[PDB]
Amino acid sequence: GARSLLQFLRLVGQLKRVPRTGWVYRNVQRPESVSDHMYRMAVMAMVIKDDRLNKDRCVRLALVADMAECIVGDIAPADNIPKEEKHRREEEAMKQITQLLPEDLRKELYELWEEYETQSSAEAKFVKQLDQCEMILQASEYEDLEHKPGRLQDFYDSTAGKFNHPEIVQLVSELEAERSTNIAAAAS
Which residues lie near a second copy (CB under 8 A)?
Answer: 2-3, 5-6, 8-10, 12-13, 15-16, 32-33, 35-36, 38-40, 42-44, 46-49, 56, 59-60, 63, 101, 105, 109, 137-138, 141, 170-171, 174-175, 178
Using rule CB under 5 A, residue 74 touches Mg ion: yes
Residue 74 binding target from Mg ion, a second copy, none, CB below 5 to 8 Å by type: Mg ion
- Of 6 and 84, CB closest to a second copy: 6
CB of 66 to Mg ion, least distance (A): 4
Residue 66 binding target from Mg ion, a second copy, none, CB below 5 to 8 Å by type: Mg ion
HEC sequence for the chain: CCHHHHHHHHHHHHHHHCECHHHHCCCCCCCCEHHHHHHHHHHHHHHCCCCCCCHHHHHHHHHHCCCCHHHHCCCCHHHCCCHHHHHHHHHHHHHHHHCCCCHHHHHHHHHHHHHHHHCCCHHHHHHHHHHHHHHHHHHHHHHHHHCCCCCCHHHHHHCCCCCCCHHHHHHHHHHHHHHHHHHHHHCC
Size of the site for Mg ion (CB under 5 A): 4
Using CB under 5 A, pick the residue from 11, 12, 71, 75 that binds Mg ion.
75
Residue 5 binding target from a second copy, Mg ion, none, CB below 5 to 8 Å by type: a second copy
CB of 84 to a second copy, least distance (A): 28
CA distance 91 to 68: 8
Please give the residues from 158 up to 187 whose contact with Mg ion meets the rule CB under 5 A. none
CB of 54 to Mg ion, least distance (A): 22
- Of 2 and 187, CB closest to a second copy: 2
| Sites of contact with Mg ion (CB under 5 A) | 34, 66, 74-75
